[PDB]
Write a protein that binds this DNA or RNA. Structure first.
Lengths: 426, 133, 23, 37, 192, 136
RNA sequence: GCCCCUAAGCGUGUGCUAAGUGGAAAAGGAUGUGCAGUCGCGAAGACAACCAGGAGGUUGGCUUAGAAGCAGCCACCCUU
């Protein structure tokens, strides 16, 4: 990918759904995304439009005022709060004579610049190749000044000229072959991703997947609960790959905490099909931890966006994760006084600051009931000579305290079914 | 042969004692009775014990002693302590058993030499930071 | 590439003294 | 027998060697054995 | 503190020039100039091995009594030239001196104690100019930073010089600076 | 990021690389240094990676010092545009180094690990480099 | 250029080469030999090997399902 000069940006949108408050929230979200990507928001405006214009996405008068304001502000970058077409952007650029992009372009740029591993780097690269695929003919610069780019001649018999297919068709063929190879690669690495956790889910153990829109967890909850410090940030879309740890109850059974990358509303429908890591992880997860901010202007918007994405993937993959418990964190920030408004209709709203915080005792005590569904529930009496009667009765996972007796000891705890099925004797 | 140093004022509450007495084909109550009659009668301080079960199922122990590092444990000390070396002072040991500390055991793992007292004066003291004043 | 490599490396013979035309 | 132009010992127990001309590393652990080729 | 001069041999260079110098260097000799207050230009061919050995043993400041065709010449090293890629000597300047000359000399400084267990110690410049006689030239002066609180700047104003030694440079230039040990955050920040 | 604040001329010839570096042939700031042994065109990302490796090796002590800096804007031709019609835009910040120049310096208590990290940084560079000492 | 083709030497001596390198080549690694210096031991027989040496309060450390020399931890002023 290619990164150019930033920090001089304008924002254009059309408010065709929701209310003025929602349009403003979308504008603010775009502003925050641009800020994180490394831009300085100068002016962002929304037009009350039923549907975007098929020429400039804004309209003639809107484009005029945008030209005026951008010329006065000395910026050269425009950002549309949506998914514009090559036709839209061609006019939107011819009207201003400065670079133009949209929110999906911004998100692909930030993903590309935040990518950590070759895996995600290739995923994001494929996303941007497939977004730029339509602009072969749509690339007016590629298909302009091209008089005589090929052999515009014919004849009966010997021609000797070998553009047997239109130059544009050859370009389409080559880019299609490149994209096919990349798709084959991203499908191939499915097996690599699988074998990486192959050991996991073989020895069945509860898996709690931490889900949340972007800027919700940013691995902060992971670092706070498990105790393992990983890349945690207040910026957006910082955790680019998942990570599991050992955190659990006092019980020896591990509760593998599955990290999840953020999910921004209104995805560009290019990563939801490429970045399969988190999707597969939530598919195979046993419990779900839904992260929410208690000081946001509309937490319910993100809540339902996440719920919708989850339901879509669930119906797509033929699964059903019943356990779905939410948690309204970011209350220690004290930046939201709608705490009563949230609590009057949303239980399990424990409080943790944006980056730090505590008070997850109630969280854990309420979450355990949904994962501590073991079937052991077997007691036994070990005889005088314990000897080797310590292997899986004490040196195991979910092992509990018990009483003591002269004839060895009455172990009133629970022994795992697969580990110790019948080895014990009452 | 097993040896222990954790709190010894016990009446078979924990696995180290109860199962130990009930295992290894020893009498279920004879050694416990002797243990309680002798060591607990003698204030039941820290009393390491070595298991050398003969064919008669009886191994007479002695009035053992922790090293010069933690003699206060038996003398007048609390069970508390530290794990890191060179840790802050926890307690002191008065110059009352300066020689009696050397009357318990005199040997090492290897057959190198003797004077385990002259060894322990500084061997196992600096491990946790326990002081001797 | 082999063709060009061989052509230009033939210049390292004692008779060429390291200078060889078109190489 | 992970092969590559570069190798090196992992543990103090594995030792390099020049076996049959090709260089290898013999380790008591079968997971750390490697060859240059 | 009174060192003893090191006996050495040094033959008068018959022919000079770049070719002669290169040939002598290949052989193992080294071309050097023995000048002095007496204005005595000379072109000697020293032994590279002995020259290196005496430098490493007695440092850079070592009285070399080099036999000038039977008679001896008391020479003091001023500066030496080492090729960057080979670290091999190419020439040096020698000053012909006698007993009873307080000629300026250059010395280095090391540290005996390391630092406190919660701070750090670094070197600014280990090059100090002193006034010592010709037959007694100190070397490698020690610096006391044993368990000293950070934030201090030890200049040449508290260096204990041996008998018959005087400082040249002002006691204000920074020689050592006990600076607080940084953390990982600061260590990444510096140079980012 | 290490970039020049500005440049007198934004486009300049390629830097001639010949002979041995006259200066910067010893460790001045630190104690152990990276003495290069071949002409090279180092770049901002390269030096940044080397520093990242060094500071990841070093936890909460010691010090590292950058000797060289990329002060030559190297222009790469833009997209295909065949060839000709003016010079390319500045795309890299390169520093020329000749044999003998010192790139990195460090002062670290743990000598073994210091030399280890130094060797790693050297491997990260595109040319052979020895480890040299401030003293003789 | 000098073994045959192919005219002239399977030349004379001192060393290297194990790869047919010679008779393509990089970053990198590496108990090959050829040859310079250098280390504390050290022709006391050094060193290796055969070797008596198997829980010192040695189941402490953070702790009590045991912390059972021994999952691991910050110290080894410890000797007829």
């Amino acid at each position: 990918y290619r990164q150019l000069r930033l920090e001089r940006v304008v924002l254009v949108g059309v408010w065709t759904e929701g209310s003025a408050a929602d349009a403003e929230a979308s504008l603010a979200e775009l502003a925050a995304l641009a800020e994180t990507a490394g831009s300085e928001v100068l002016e962002g405006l929304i037009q009350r439009r039923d549907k975007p214009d098929p020429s400039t996405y804004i309209g003639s008068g809107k484009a005029a005022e945008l030209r005026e304001v951008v010329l006065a502000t000395g910026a050269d970058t425009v950002i549309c709060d949506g998914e514009l077409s090559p036709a839209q952007l061609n006019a939107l650029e011819k009207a201003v004579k400065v670079k133009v992009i949209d929110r999906t372009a911004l998100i692909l740029d930030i993903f590309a610049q935040h990518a950590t591993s070759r895996e995600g780097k290739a995923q994001v690269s494929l996303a941007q190749m497939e977004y730029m695929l339509p602009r072969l003919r749509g690339w007016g610069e590629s298909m302009s000044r091209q008089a005589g780019g090929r052999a515009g001649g014919a004849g009966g018999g010997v021609g000797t000229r070998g553009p047997g297919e239109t130059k544009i068709e050859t370009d389409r063929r080559r880019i299609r072959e490149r994209m096919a190879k990349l798709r084959r690669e991203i499908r191939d690495m499915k097996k690599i991703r699988d074998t990486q956790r192959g050991s996991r889910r073989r020895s069945e153990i509860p898996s709690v997947a931490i889900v949340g829109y972007t800027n919700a967890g940013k691995s902060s909850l992971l670092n706070a609960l498990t105790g393992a410090g990983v890349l945690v940030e207040n910026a957006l879309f910082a955790t680019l790959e998942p990570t599991t740890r050992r955190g659990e109850f006092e019980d020896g059974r591990p509760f593998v905490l599955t990290d999840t990358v953020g999910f921004v509303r209104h995805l560009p429908t290019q990563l939801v099909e490429a970045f399969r890591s988190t999707l597969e992880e939530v598919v195979d997860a046993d419990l779900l931890i839904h992260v929410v901010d208690g000081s946001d202007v509309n937490p319910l918007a993100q809540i339902n966006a996440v719920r919708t994405v989850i339901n879509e993937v669930v119906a797509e993959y033929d699964i059903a994760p019943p356990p779905e418990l939410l948690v309204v964190n970011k209350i220690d920030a004290a930046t939201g006084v709608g705490l009563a408004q949230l609590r009057r209709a949303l239980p399990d709203a424990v409080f943790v600051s944006a980056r730090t915080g505590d008070g997850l005792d109630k969280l854990r005590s309420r979450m355990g009931e949904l994962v501590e569904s073991t079937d052991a529930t077997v007691d036994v009496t070990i005889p005088y000579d314990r000897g080797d009667l310590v292997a899986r009765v004490h040196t195991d996972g979910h092992v509990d305290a018990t009483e003591h007796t002269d004839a060895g000891t009455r172990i009133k705890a629970r022994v795992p079914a697969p580990l110790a099925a019948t080895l014990r004797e009452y | 042969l097993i040896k222990l140093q954790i709190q010894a004022g016990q009446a078979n509450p924990a696995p180290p004692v109860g199962p130990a007495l009930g295992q290894h084909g020893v009498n279920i109550m004879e050694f416990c009775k002797a243990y309680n009659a002798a060591t607990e009668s003698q204030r039941g301080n820290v009393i390491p014990v070595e298991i050398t079960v003969y064919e008669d199922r009886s191994f007479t122990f002695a009035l053992k002693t922790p090293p010069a590092a933690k003699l206060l444990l038996k003398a007048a000390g609390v069970q508390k302590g530290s794990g890191e070396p060179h840790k802050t002072k926890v307690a002191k040991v008065t110059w009352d058993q300066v020689r009696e500390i050397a009357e318990t055991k005199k040997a090492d793992l290897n057959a190198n030499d003797i004077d385990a007292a002259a060894k322990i004066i500084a061997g196992t003291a600096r491990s946790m930071g326990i002081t001797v004043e | 590439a082999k063709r060009g490599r061989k052509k230009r490396d033939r210049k390292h013979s004692k008779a060429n003294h390291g200078k060889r035309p078109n190489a | 027998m992970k092969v590559n132009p570069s190798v090196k010992p992992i543990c103090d127990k594995c030792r390099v060697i020049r076996r049959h001309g090709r260089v290898m590393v013999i380790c008591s652990d079968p997971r750390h054995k490697q060859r240059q080729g | 503190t009174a060192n003893i001069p090191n006996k050495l041999t040094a033959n008068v260079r018959t022919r000079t020039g770049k070719g002669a110098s290169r040939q002598a260097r290949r052989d193992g000799k080294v071309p050097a100039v023995l000048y002095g207050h007496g204005t005595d230009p000379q072109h000697l061919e020293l032994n590279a091995r002995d020259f290196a050995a005496v430098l490493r043993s007695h440092g850079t400041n070592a009285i070399l009594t080099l036999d000038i065709e039977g008679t001896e010449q008391l020479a003091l090293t001023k500066a030496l030239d080492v090729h960057p890629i080979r670290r091999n000597i190419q020439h040096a300047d020698l000053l012909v001196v006698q007993r009873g000359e307080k000629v300026t000399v250059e010395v280095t400084v090391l540290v005996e104690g390391d630092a406190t267990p919660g701070t750090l110690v670094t070197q600014d410049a280990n090059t100090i100019e002193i006034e010592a006689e010709a037959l007694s030239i100190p070397e490698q002066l020690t610096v006391s930073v044993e368990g000293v609180e950070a934030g201090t700047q030890i200049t040449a104003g508290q260096i204990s010089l041996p008998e018959g030694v005087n400082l040249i440079s002002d006691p204000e230039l920074l020689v050592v600076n006990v600076v607080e040990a940084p953390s990982a955050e600061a260590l990444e920040e510096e140079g980012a | 990021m290490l970039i020049p604040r500005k440049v007198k001329h934004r486009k300049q010839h390629h830097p001639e690389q010949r002979g041995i570096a006259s200066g910067g042939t010893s460790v001045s700031f630190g104690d152990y240094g990276i003495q290069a042994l071949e002409h090279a065109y180092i770049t901002n990302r390269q030096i940044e990676s080397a520093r990242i490796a060094i500071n990841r090796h070093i936890k909460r002590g010691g010090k590292v010092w950058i000797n060289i800096f990329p002060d030559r804007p190297l222009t790469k031709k833009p997209a295909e545009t065949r060839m000709g019609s003016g010079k390319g835009s500045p795309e890299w910040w390169v520093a020329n180094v000749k044999p003998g120049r010192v790139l990195f310096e460090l002062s670290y208590p743990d000598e073994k690990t210091a030399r280890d990290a130094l060797t790693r940084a050297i491997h990260k560079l595109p040319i052979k480099a020895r480890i040299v000492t401030r003293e003789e």
